[PDB]
Structure 1
């Protein structure tokens, strides 16, 4: 309840027509910074859609160069799209982005449109990529174990056998959902790019063609 009220207040304060007193503009800027900082970890929580909507509305303004936070919000959105592999948060952001663009007749800054270039869901890598060197003790040593009762050991076995099948099912569900999210995001991105091309905005052509070249081979 309190987080809902806080996010609603942040959204209300973010909307400032840049014509009121400078105190209100400062309030809106601080609210936008707070929302930008909050979404870095509260993305997997309730009412993330409101934060996404307010941040994208701030970004999708016709003039954002005077805004002292557009750089940071674009960086955060790019990081969110880059680190998201399953495609759930990416699709959630892209739906709102398309909804906002359709209202503005697809008129944004090339830089804004550049966030779609960082979509991890539309990227494919080597099946055997080398991750970072991560080292940990494989198993607790036998002579350094903690005593467990027979009932405790039986419960440990049961919960391990449950967890193994839960992990298998989780992997299967993630694999089957990534493909569908990828298809939906491809549809949305290609629709946005084609609408931009039909509008023929002289300041957005290069980014659009780069997006087509990057994501062209991921489609059907």
Structure 2
């Protein structure tokens, strides 16, 4: 029971530092090699120490109160701290279970740090130590992965000016350029979380001060007024710079996946290209749509059914997202596809294959390109034709009905319910037009007493 004595020694060191510079250096001397219990019981104990004691002003840019020996203490010891974390989580799957458990607890320590740290200039090391853990072809043995994805998502949801996001996605780009885009789709969901890109918008109780102290207070208020206005101007320029370079990073990540053509990733690629579209150069809107037309035409040489449905739904969602300012091959895309859609057995599939987490606010966040199976892709394509993005076309109303009735013969039950519910809405729009023969008695009592 040597562990108990070590626990109380480390506990005494915690009560020293929390309430002093040699003690923290001693705590970093604890974790070197060969002694796993000291390598794990103190490493997770230094986390609340750093959570309480880290000054968020970018420390290390080189009187009675020194504040220089204390800061060389914090920084120099933090180097070997994170450097130790580097050596810990670099261990591959073919290792000792002690070392592997040290790796899991090390990334747990790191992801706990990031929520409070990442302010000062020893952040990129921790960002590599978590993104290299996420960007792996096989995730089924790491319980931390889901939580690290969550922490990165929160990081990209508080980041207003874009400094954090740019410093993440530079490292992230390096990893995605060395490995030929073997990503797990949840990582493109954390790409969706970026709030940098989108906009979506007394007299009695006074402590008495001296005349020199009041004049000092007036001057300090005027300095702080300048700091408010200057930082407003700086961050307003920084937001523009970060949008300009992050969109370059984000799009090239996307289009290189659209080179490799991974069967699962395309849904999340077009999640991004429709959300973070309409904030590009506005010359690229015609270029994005011509890419969508190209990705339709690739499927016209013969899984691919999913891809072409994605292209249609994405295009209409793009133009329906153009909120500020004031489509043949896509409607004809549907009018050609409808045989191929109904001729496949894979219409209903939950789609929870390689994605671990359902990202953020899935009740509020409506994933307007990859909502569910493929049944809601037919529903949302048709909704994005006859209810969004005009294309009125009474002729196409009659044509789409006559193709849906040659699709009822090739449908599972739930899909045919939904299709007939849309035909109810087409009777609402265009007045012309357990069982098996349910409710067709209703609609065929809207041909004969109408026509």
What TM-score, normalized by structure 1, do the two folds share?
Answer: 0.92
- Tell me the SS of whatever aligns to 1:143: coil
Aligned residues: 206
User: Quick check: 2:111–2:151 contact (8 Å CA) kept in 1?
Assistant: yes
1:27, distance to aligned residue in structure 2 (A): 0.7
Aligned counterparts of 1:156 and 1:111: Cα–Cα separation in 2: 51
Alignment correspondent of 1:134: none
User: Which structure has the highest helix share of the two?
Assistant: 1
Q: Residue 185 of structure 2 contacts residue 264 of structure 2 at CA under 8 Å; is this kept in 1? A: yes
Distance in 1 between residues matched to 2:205 and 2:122, nearest whole Å: 46
Residue 111 of structure 2 is aligned with which of 8, 12, 36?
Answer: 36
Cα offset, 1:110, TM superposition: 1.0
Kindly name which structure, 1 or 2, has the bigger radius of gyration based on alpha carbons.
2
Deviation at 1:46, TM superposition (A): 2.3
1:45-74: per-residue Cα shift (whole Å, max 9, x none)? 121000000100000011122211001100
Q: Please report how far the alpha carbon of residue 176 of structure 1 lies from its aligned counterpart in structure 2 after TM superposition.
A: 0.8
Q: How far off its partner does 1:201 sit?
A: 0.8
Using the alignment, how far apart are the partners of 1:112 and 1:150 within structure 2? 58
Question: Is 1:17 equivalent to 2:78 in the alignment?
Answer: no
Q: Which has the bigger relative contact order, CA under 8 A and spacing at least 6?
A: 1
Q: Cα distance, 1:162 vs. partner? A: 1.0
Q: Is this contact kept in 1: 2:163–2:242, CA < 8 A? A: yes
Q: Give the RMSD, CA atoms, in angstroms.
A: 0.8
Offset of 1:150 from its aligned partner? 0.7
Quote the Cα distance in structure 2 between the aligned partners of 1:52 and 1:164. 35
Residues 81-110 of structure 1, C-alpha deviation per residue, up to 9 Å, x if partnerless?
111111000000000101000011111111
Alignment match, 1:180: 241
User: How far 1:39 sits from its partner (Å)?
Assistant: 0.7
- C-alpha distance in 2 between matches for 1:111 and 1:165: 43
**Local SS of the residue matching 1:120:** coil
Does structure 1 residue 65 correspond to structure 2 residue 140?
A: yes
**Is the deviation greater in 190-199 or in 107-116?**
107-116
Query: How far did residue 80 of structure 1 move?
Result: 0.3
Structure 1 CA distance for aligned equivalents of residues 78 and 139 of structure 2? 28
Cα distance in 1 for partners of 2:140, 2:276 equals 28
Q: Which runs of 5+ in 2 are unaligned?
A: 1-75, 282-451
Structure 1 unaligned residues grouped into runs of 5+? 127-140
SS at match of 1:121: coil
Instruction: State the alpha-carbon separation in 2 of the partners of residues 114 and 148 from structure 1.
Output: 54
Q: Which of these residues, 51, 58, 67, is aligned with residue 126 of structure 2?
A: 51
The offset of 1:112, in angstroms, is: 1.7
| Stretches of 4+ aligned residues off by more than 4 angstroms | none
Give the C-alpha shift of residue 114 in structure 1. 1.5
Q: What are the Cα deviations for residues 125-184 of structure 1, in whole angstroms up to 9, with x where unaligned?
A: 21xxxxxxxxxxxxxx11111111111111111111111011110111011110110110
SS for the counterpart of 2:253 is helix
2:261 to 172, 189, 200: 200
Which whole-Å CA distance do the structure 1 matches of 2:190 and 2:205 have between them? 50
- The 1-side partners of 2:134 and 2:153 are apart by 12
